[PDB]
Design a binder for this molecule. Sequence first.
Ligand SMILES: Nc1ncnc2c1ncn2[C@@H]1O[C@H](COP(=O)(O)OP(=O)(O)O)[C@@H](O)[C@H]1O
Ligand SMILES: [Cl-]
Ligand SMILES: [Cl-]
Ligand SMILES: [Cl-]
Ligand SMILES: [Cl-]
Ligand SMILES: [Cl-]
Length: 481
Amino acid sequence: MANAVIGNVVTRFPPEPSGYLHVGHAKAAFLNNYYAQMYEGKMLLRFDDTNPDIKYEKSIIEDLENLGLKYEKISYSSDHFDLLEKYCIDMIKMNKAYADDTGVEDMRNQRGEGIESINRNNSIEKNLELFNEMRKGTEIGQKNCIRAKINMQSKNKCMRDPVMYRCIKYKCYPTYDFACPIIDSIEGVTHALRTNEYSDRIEQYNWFISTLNLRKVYIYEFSRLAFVKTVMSKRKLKWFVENNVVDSWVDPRFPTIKGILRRGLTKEALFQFILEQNLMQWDKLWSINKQIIDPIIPRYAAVDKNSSILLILTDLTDQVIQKERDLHMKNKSLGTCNMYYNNKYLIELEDAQTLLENEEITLIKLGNIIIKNIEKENGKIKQINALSNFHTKKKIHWLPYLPQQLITCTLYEYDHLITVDKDDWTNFINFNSKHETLVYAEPSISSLKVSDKFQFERRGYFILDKIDPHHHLHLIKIPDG
Ligand SMILES: Nc1ncnc2c1ncn2[C@@H]1O[C@H](COP(=O)(O)OP(=O)(O)O)[C@@H](O)[C@H]1O
Ligand SMILES: [Cl-]
Ligand SMILES: [Cl-]
Ligand SMILES: [Cl-]
Ligand SMILES: [Cl-]
Ligand SMILES: [Cl-]
């Protein structure tokens, strides 16, 4: 941040309302916030509608609210079109801008080979009256674009007469390249943050600023954020949606901020992952998210609904005993859930198959028990009979066989959308990347409210997405890196 001064820093986040925000957007928005906060500065939110819906502006304001960012003001590039017009005319009168009717292909490698276009020497007043043709929309006007008069022979291709105004309320619109430095300057930005993929652009940016004798804006570049096995092109994502491969932009497989928060990511983890680091691997982002959520979420129990095996404590009765226990043992201010138990339990079959005819084991948060026999009807295991011994390296989780109180849950597990890491690209999709499994979970889990994060013991981490009628829960699995 060159020549930054505490209390005199202004940054801005300038997304286009042409789609929903994704993770890379989140890096930009966050870094703008981080540099503004570092100097006790101000951060503007600019909707960049230079070359133009409102559903997107709404979605943006909600995603920013969700990331916890707050802005001093909201502006639209549109709001300065009249002024940009004025500046355009000024440049025409300084012989710094001219009207051009050379064709797009021709113009493209006239630029490539550095020959001055025909109109580069146009008189001032022809340039102005052509600009008027453009502002009215005449067939002349549409054949004409205004461009800056810089240097067709510069080693920097961005310095070779870039287009400033195009004919397309307004009949003519400024390009990004021209609108960005002017608007940044007059809005009071002091430090404009931009992806360093647009890096040849800087000399042009500053050119415009000095050529109009405007207050300089420093540029701070950063790397763009891209992930393996991920697509963030807006066209590829709408393709996913239109073929019902997903059925919403909020799908947990989508790198949108909405989708990624639904999937379990915490804003804290995303910000830390941005600070504490060719594509990136989701593994480290989800490992940070794990480290962050693990000590502040409760632990509940679940067993497979269908493969569950019945365990009997022969020496107890069918009187259900209740015991308050703590949700998370380590952080004892997280609260207490309730634990119900009696003589009949459900355990996993992957656990049932592991018990030998006289082992001692431990039902977590309850106590040790003594396995007595393994009744196996047909080939499978039908039932297990054990002994209370409440007063071992086989500690298993369990549910009390109380079906009118156990909560039924669908576990959604997701895989990457595409198969390669980065025209016949749809052959690299994973369509069967949404896995459902049904479980019973602990009665006390009815406490949870939608959006809550928790852990299923010896299963993994989950977020409660929706609650169906009849208290049926939908649980999205949070990857754990
Ligand atoms: N993948 C990305 N990673 C980081 N920052 C990005 C990424 N994509 C866009 N940005 C930044 O997001 C801001 C708004 O982007 P937007 O105008 O929507 O541009 P784009 O057309 O590149 O999506 C810009 O500052 C842009 O440089
Ligand atoms: Cl960086
Ligand atoms: Cl892509
Ligand atoms: Cl959905
Ligand atoms: Cl990064
Ligand atoms: Cl995968």
